[PDB]
Amino acid sequence: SKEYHIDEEVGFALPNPQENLPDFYNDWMFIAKHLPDLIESGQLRERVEKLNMLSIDHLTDHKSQRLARLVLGCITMAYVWGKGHGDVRKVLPRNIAVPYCQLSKKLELPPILVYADCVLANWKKKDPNKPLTYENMDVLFSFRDGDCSKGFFLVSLLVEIAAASAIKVIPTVFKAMQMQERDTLLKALLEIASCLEKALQVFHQIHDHVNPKAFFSVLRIYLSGWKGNPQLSDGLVYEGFWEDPKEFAGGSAGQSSVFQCFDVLLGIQQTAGGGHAAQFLQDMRRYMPPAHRNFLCSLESNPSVREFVLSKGDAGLREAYDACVKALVSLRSYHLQIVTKYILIPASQGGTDLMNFLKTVRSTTEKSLLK
Ligand code: HEM
Ligand SMILES: O[C@H](C[C@H]1c2c(F)cccc2-c2cncn21)C1CCCCC1
């Protein structure tokens, strides 16, 4: 891989994300790292409006720019949702709204917290000399004490990182088809199947670090957007940048590039046909970092791995390809069970539209098998 901002150790996630901003922005960093206290004490929204308007120009690097996106993205969800009990702000104050908006446009991302903010850039190792495992890692920002945002964000990230092992194999696959190296391609496909199988065990960590009640009744609220949302029917007003209200989707792992890229690699056309599911995953590419959505584009313009394997009448190649697809079905099926426990059952003591989305996506993946 190249300038697509993909790391051989960490994948689509951002290696060594920046923890501190320049001292120009302590009024921002102060609010973001005390979100639990300021929300509970009802002091958050006033401290948003007591801020003055800071320029973007002192955010020099890519890392500081993305950390500043994480900082302002969190404050925005906190300001808009408050303590998450239904009273919402519809006007985002200018002294935070235009710095957020100008920064979002420099990074080609929408002015709302996305996956690449709160997962791919929201982490750090405790001891930098020990490995990437849950016990040596922490998030940088949370919303409320007990919101399980750390468990939820880190376990996502750990799955993203398990998938990095398979991403570095992708160039091997295409070179092998181009150079007509069937044994090379067979081994490459088995290697990708093996990685997707290992990423399944990483999902099991979710049960030890997230509990359904807190996730459903707290974290979910701070991840909500203002598109198709009854509470903000027309969107949100970004003071002093636009005057119209604007609607942007809440956080979704449909914004994760790692499952989209394996759908594209294998020729599982998740974005084909005029269904809501295909529509939503295409729209969510606008909420990916431009470098990552460029990488999905260049995979799509390479010749299809699926029809290469079909064109050959090769049981070995067909079995290896189906191994990868079976492993994707396994992840989405385990993930579907997670959603039953963490959304469907809590909601019972909406969710059906979410299950139906995942089931459409799993059903498409299942239909891509050969034998
Ligand atoms: C408490 C744990 C989790 C819950 C309740 C949950 C729930 C959901 C829901 C409701 C969706 C619907 C689409 C959307 O709005 O994003 C979704 C999609 C998705 N989730 Fe999760 N999720 C959880 C954990 C994870 C983890 C750890 C990953 C690791 C990467 C992950 C990966 C995905 C992906 C890739 C999608 C897009 C659909 C697909 O490609 O199959 N999820 N999830
Ligand atoms: O699935 C998204 C949340 C999303 C998400 C983030 F917004 C941030 C970090 C990880 C994830 C995630 C992982 N799987 C789904 N999602 C929400 C949809 C509405 C119900 C609550 C979950």
XYZ file of C-alpha atoms and ligand atoms in Angstrom:
436
model
C 0.000 0.000 0.000
C 1.051 3.633 -0.686
C -0.163 7.161 0.158
C -3.552 5.719 1.132
C -2.679 6.222 4.818
C -2.672 2.499 5.638
C -0.250 1.197 8.257
C 1.202 -2.313 8.159
C 0.821 -2.726 11.932
C -2.400 -0.829 12.602
C -4.212 -0.794 9.263
C -6.744 1.954 8.683
C -6.293 3.241 12.220
C -3.971 6.155 12.809
C -0.585 5.054 14.213
C 0.516 6.805 17.421
C -2.339 9.348 17.446
C -1.484 12.685 18.986
C -2.570 13.224 22.595
C -1.890 16.953 23.090
C -2.664 20.075 21.061
C -0.508 23.214 21.054
C -0.992 25.490 24.030
C -2.990 27.825 21.777
C -5.938 25.381 22.205
C -6.059 24.661 25.966
C -9.567 26.098 26.132
C -10.581 23.316 23.725
C -8.538 20.556 25.364
C -9.766 21.537 28.814
C -13.435 21.034 27.889
C -12.903 17.780 25.967
C -10.997 15.952 28.743
C -13.516 16.886 31.432
C -16.623 15.956 29.465
C -17.963 13.668 32.254
C -17.820 16.359 34.959
C -18.982 19.295 32.810
C -22.013 17.416 31.448
C -23.144 16.126 34.858
C -22.752 19.564 36.491
C -24.575 21.256 33.588
C -21.543 23.479 33.024
C -20.592 22.161 29.581
C -22.854 24.253 27.341
C -21.961 27.570 29.006
C -18.256 26.832 28.706
C -18.839 26.179 25.007
C -20.365 29.661 24.706
C -17.658 31.267 26.862
C -14.970 30.177 24.389
C -13.541 32.675 21.964
C -12.969 31.790 18.310
C -9.553 30.209 17.764
C -7.887 30.000 14.369
C -7.003 26.727 12.668
C -3.623 27.859 11.391
C -1.671 26.678 14.438
C -2.684 23.064 13.764
C 0.415 22.275 11.737
C 0.423 18.514 11.178
C -2.026 15.872 10.039
C -2.064 14.345 13.534
C -2.864 17.569 15.373
C -5.543 18.341 12.801
C -7.172 14.957 13.430
C -6.826 15.239 17.202
C -8.522 18.639 16.985
C -11.307 16.938 15.000
C -11.683 14.400 17.806
C -11.719 17.162 20.446
C -14.310 19.376 18.737
C -16.357 16.384 17.604
C -16.841 15.282 21.210
C -17.688 18.734 22.537
C -20.258 19.022 19.745
C -22.044 15.791 20.696
C -21.956 16.862 24.349
C -23.284 20.334 23.557
C -26.002 19.079 21.205
C -27.168 16.179 23.446
C -26.425 17.630 26.881
C -26.856 14.938 29.525
C -28.589 12.737 26.976
C -32.095 12.933 28.418
C -33.810 14.574 25.438
C -33.221 18.333 25.819
C -31.243 19.273 22.727
C -29.497 22.338 21.427
C -30.196 23.090 17.800
C -27.742 25.987 17.431
C -24.043 25.211 17.594
C -22.239 28.397 18.787
C -20.054 30.155 16.234
C -16.822 30.255 18.249
C -16.767 26.434 18.106
C -18.866 25.878 14.989
C -16.782 27.661 12.376
C -13.374 26.326 13.648
C -14.979 22.852 13.539
C -16.395 23.485 10.064
C -13.235 25.028 8.532
C -11.201 22.122 9.929
C -13.651 19.528 8.630
C -13.370 21.054 5.143
C -9.552 20.981 5.207
C -9.778 17.234 5.994
C -12.691 16.546 3.577
C -14.886 15.197 6.407
C -18.337 16.257 7.630
C -18.700 18.456 10.840
C -19.803 15.599 13.066
C -18.025 12.926 15.081
C -17.280 9.949 12.798
C -15.720 6.494 13.224
C -12.252 7.609 12.135
C -12.387 10.234 14.908
C -13.558 8.271 17.946
C -12.051 4.902 17.036
C -9.149 5.283 14.624
C -7.710 8.420 16.299
C -8.982 8.012 19.886
C -6.395 5.632 21.355
C -2.961 5.355 22.961
C -0.747 2.682 24.421
C -0.103 2.772 28.145
C 3.449 1.448 27.903
C 4.740 2.024 24.340
C 7.105 -0.991 24.653
C 4.440 -3.714 25.219
C 1.976 -4.931 22.536
C -1.318 -3.686 21.085
C -3.673 -5.414 23.501
C -6.653 -4.095 25.470
C -4.725 -3.983 28.773
C -1.936 -1.856 27.293
C -4.338 0.618 25.670
C -6.718 3.402 26.570
C -9.033 5.827 24.802
C -8.388 9.568 24.928
C -11.914 10.923 25.329
C -15.168 9.703 26.839
C -18.563 11.333 27.353
C -19.888 10.067 30.715
C -18.483 8.015 33.543
C -19.727 4.478 32.991
C -20.600 4.950 29.315
C -18.385 2.003 28.258
C -16.986 4.224 25.493
C -13.515 2.837 26.144
C -14.536 -0.810 25.827
C -16.682 -0.022 22.809
C -14.075 2.084 21.010
C -11.027 -0.079 21.833
C -12.662 -3.393 20.893
C -13.656 -1.844 17.557
C -10.064 -0.680 17.127
C -8.694 -4.112 18.047
C -10.855 -5.657 15.323
C -9.654 -3.005 12.877
C -6.076 -3.953 13.808
C -6.589 -7.709 13.453
C -7.772 -6.931 9.926
C -4.545 -5.058 9.097
C -2.824 -8.444 8.774
C -5.058 -9.191 5.796
C -4.801 -5.731 4.199
C -1.055 -6.086 3.558
C -1.835 -9.248 1.557
C -4.113 -7.383 -0.875
C -1.262 -6.313 -3.224
C -0.175 -9.961 -3.386
C -3.638 -10.992 -4.590
C -3.790 -8.569 -7.516
C -0.179 -9.007 -8.605
C -0.838 -12.764 -8.609
C -3.855 -12.389 -10.918
C -1.956 -10.009 -13.190
C 1.137 -12.248 -13.336
C -0.991 -15.429 -13.653
C 0.480 -17.067 -10.517
C -2.225 -19.427 -9.358
C -0.269 -20.981 -6.483
C 0.680 -17.514 -5.186
C -2.948 -16.375 -5.356
C -4.182 -19.522 -3.648
C -1.852 -18.975 -0.692
C -2.716 -15.278 -0.525
C -6.413 -16.123 -0.338
C -5.859 -18.685 2.449
C -3.818 -16.091 4.337
C -6.650 -13.568 4.144
C -9.137 -16.234 5.251
C -6.911 -16.999 8.254
C -6.859 -13.334 9.302
C -10.639 -12.845 9.104
C -10.977 -15.975 11.275
C -8.598 -14.556 13.905
C -10.481 -11.240 13.872
C -13.558 -13.186 15.014
C -11.989 -14.054 18.401
C -11.223 -10.352 18.884
C -14.980 -9.665 18.772
C -15.434 -11.875 21.862
C -13.734 -9.211 24.008
C -16.841 -7.018 23.668
C -18.702 -9.005 26.328
C -16.081 -8.311 29.019
C -15.794 -4.569 28.449
C -19.286 -3.294 27.455
C -22.569 -3.836 29.256
C -25.848 -3.585 27.335
C -27.693 -1.212 29.663
C -25.008 1.490 29.662
C -24.289 1.142 25.949
C -27.928 1.368 24.966
C -29.078 4.068 27.351
C -25.996 6.322 27.358
C -23.320 5.788 24.703
C -25.896 5.382 21.932
C -27.321 8.817 22.676
C -23.992 10.660 22.332
C -23.319 8.826 19.067
C -26.630 9.922 17.498
C -26.500 12.301 14.566
C -28.971 14.788 13.140
C -30.078 13.097 9.920
C -33.549 11.573 9.925
C -33.598 12.299 13.671
C -36.989 13.370 15.123
C -35.340 15.471 17.851
C -33.487 17.606 15.253
C -35.940 17.416 12.370
C -34.138 19.868 10.049
C -30.517 19.158 11.023
C -28.199 21.424 13.008
C -27.368 25.112 12.574
C -23.599 25.683 12.407
C -23.514 29.302 13.622
C -21.656 31.695 11.362
C -20.638 29.107 8.740
C -23.943 28.147 7.108
C -27.263 29.760 7.920
C -29.390 26.846 6.778
C -29.621 23.865 9.117
C -27.603 20.912 7.813
C -28.176 17.183 8.426
C -25.314 14.747 9.028
C -25.488 11.088 10.006
C -24.451 9.833 13.417
C -21.522 7.513 13.969
C -21.748 4.223 12.080
C -19.305 1.383 11.519
C -20.518 1.497 7.952
C -17.872 4.242 7.921
C -15.216 1.632 8.778
C -13.198 1.018 5.622
C -12.020 -2.380 6.661
C -15.170 -4.417 6.055
C -15.984 -2.400 2.946
C -12.568 -3.179 1.481
C -12.995 -6.945 1.900
C -16.432 -6.755 0.281
C -14.719 -4.989 -2.638
C -11.695 -7.302 -2.742
C -13.920 -10.391 -2.919
C -16.442 -8.879 -5.317
C -19.297 -8.902 -2.773
C -21.201 -6.002 -4.345
C -22.612 -4.480 -1.166
C -23.186 -1.111 -2.890
C -25.028 -2.615 -5.884
C -28.783 -2.608 -6.426
C -31.065 0.174 -5.251
C -31.645 -1.049 -1.709
C -31.440 1.028 1.445
C -28.525 -1.119 2.621
C -26.463 -0.499 -0.519
C -27.499 3.163 -0.388
C -26.348 3.639 3.201
C -22.922 2.043 2.740
C -22.248 4.197 -0.321
C -23.260 7.351 1.555
C -21.015 6.397 4.491
C -17.916 6.574 2.304
C -18.296 10.364 2.481
C -17.666 10.049 6.233
C -14.289 8.189 5.634
C -10.961 10.015 5.423
C -10.438 10.940 1.763
C -7.250 8.832 1.584
C -9.220 5.768 2.722
C -12.134 6.311 0.356
C -9.523 6.734 -2.393
C -8.135 3.329 -1.450
C -11.590 1.729 -1.797
C -11.870 3.411 -5.189
C -8.611 1.951 -6.467
C -9.541 -1.552 -5.259
C -12.825 -1.271 -7.155
C -11.009 -0.398 -10.401
C -8.781 -3.503 -10.247
C -10.019 -6.653 -12.010
C -12.491 -8.750 -10.040
C -10.965 -11.492 -7.857
C -14.323 -13.268 -7.906
C -14.682 -13.661 -11.645
C -10.994 -14.531 -11.909
C -11.569 -17.530 -9.620
C -14.828 -18.444 -11.384
C -13.151 -18.324 -14.810
C -10.645 -21.057 -13.968
C -12.523 -24.228 -12.982
C -10.117 -24.726 -10.081
C -11.534 -26.398 -6.965
C -8.504 -25.352 -4.921
C -8.883 -21.684 -5.825
C -12.638 -21.861 -5.357
C -12.277 -23.338 -1.878
C -9.734 -20.703 -0.850
C -11.987 -17.896 -2.081
C -15.001 -19.381 -0.268
C -12.896 -19.618 2.901
C -12.625 -15.799 2.870
C -16.342 -15.342 2.242
C -17.273 -17.860 4.955
C -15.074 -15.939 7.367
C -16.891 -12.690 6.523
C -20.275 -14.404 7.087
C -18.948 -15.597 10.473
C -18.054 -12.061 11.586
C -21.380 -10.595 10.558
C -23.275 -13.474 12.197
C -21.450 -13.112 15.491
C -21.936 -9.358 15.166
C -25.662 -9.875 14.620
C -25.810 -11.781 17.928
C -23.970 -8.926 19.641
C -26.592 -6.493 18.344
C -29.442 -8.660 19.683
C -27.899 -8.566 23.174
C -26.824 -4.913 23.169
C -29.689 -3.231 21.267
C -32.653 -5.523 20.681
C -33.069 -6.857 24.230
C -32.311 -3.537 26.026
C -34.700 -1.742 23.650
C -37.403 -4.186 24.786
C -37.134 -3.410 28.523
C -35.917 1.356 15.178
C -33.840 -1.578 16.360
C -35.617 -3.735 13.764
C -34.398 -1.404 10.980
C -30.833 -1.911 12.259
C -31.130 -5.705 12.371
C -32.638 -5.669 8.886
C -29.695 -3.647 7.603
C -27.116 -6.068 9.026
C -29.130 -9.034 7.766
C -29.264 -7.612 4.235
C -25.496 -7.145 4.355
C -24.930 -10.656 5.727
C -27.353 -12.129 3.179
C -25.443 -10.483 0.303
C -22.163 -11.832 1.691
C -23.693 -15.328 1.973
C -24.903 -15.229 -1.644
C -21.339 -14.683 -2.875
C -20.240 -18.249 -2.153
C -19.528 -20.523 -5.117
C -20.065 -24.194 -4.143
C -21.814 -3.338 21.467
C -21.185 -3.661 20.329
C -21.752 -3.350 18.921
C -23.009 -3.005 18.568
C -24.277 -2.833 19.442
C -23.027 -2.807 17.142
C -24.131 -2.439 16.414
C -24.163 -2.172 15.065
C -25.287 -1.628 14.334
C -26.660 -1.244 14.936
C -24.934 -1.504 13.052
C -25.901 -0.943 11.986
C -25.188 -0.099 10.937
C -24.688 1.146 11.589
O -25.582 1.965 11.891
O -23.452 1.298 11.810
C -23.552 -1.971 12.916
C -22.758 -2.028 11.778
C -21.430 -2.408 11.712
N -20.609 -2.775 12.772
Fe -21.170 -2.901 14.754
N -21.757 -3.040 16.660
C -20.933 -3.365 17.718
C -19.586 -3.678 17.641
C -18.803 -3.685 16.505
C -17.365 -3.878 16.436
C -16.410 -4.095 17.627
C -16.980 -3.810 15.163
C -15.512 -3.962 14.715
C -15.074 -3.381 13.594
C -18.164 -3.596 14.347
C -18.245 -3.477 12.980
C -19.357 -3.085 12.267
C -19.412 -2.895 10.827
C -18.255 -3.122 9.836
C -20.642 -2.497 10.499
C -21.122 -2.193 9.074
C -22.057 -3.319 8.653
C -21.241 -4.396 7.985
O -20.255 -4.086 7.252
O -21.579 -5.585 8.204
N -19.245 -3.517 15.204
N -23.130 -2.375 14.174
O -23.821 1.370 15.137
C -23.761 2.762 15.454
C -22.489 3.078 16.256
C -21.151 2.682 15.555
C -20.010 3.230 16.129
C -19.702 4.497 16.450
F -20.612 5.526 16.247
C -18.471 4.783 17.009
C -17.578 3.738 17.205
C -17.936 2.450 16.829
C -19.127 2.223 16.274
C -19.656 1.057 15.876
C -19.349 -0.234 15.762
N -20.398 -0.841 15.253
C -21.364 0.035 15.045
N -20.881 1.236 15.362
C -25.004 3.148 16.283
C -26.283 2.971 15.458
C -27.502 3.348 16.281
C -27.557 2.440 17.496
C -26.311 2.601 18.329
C -25.089 2.238 17.492
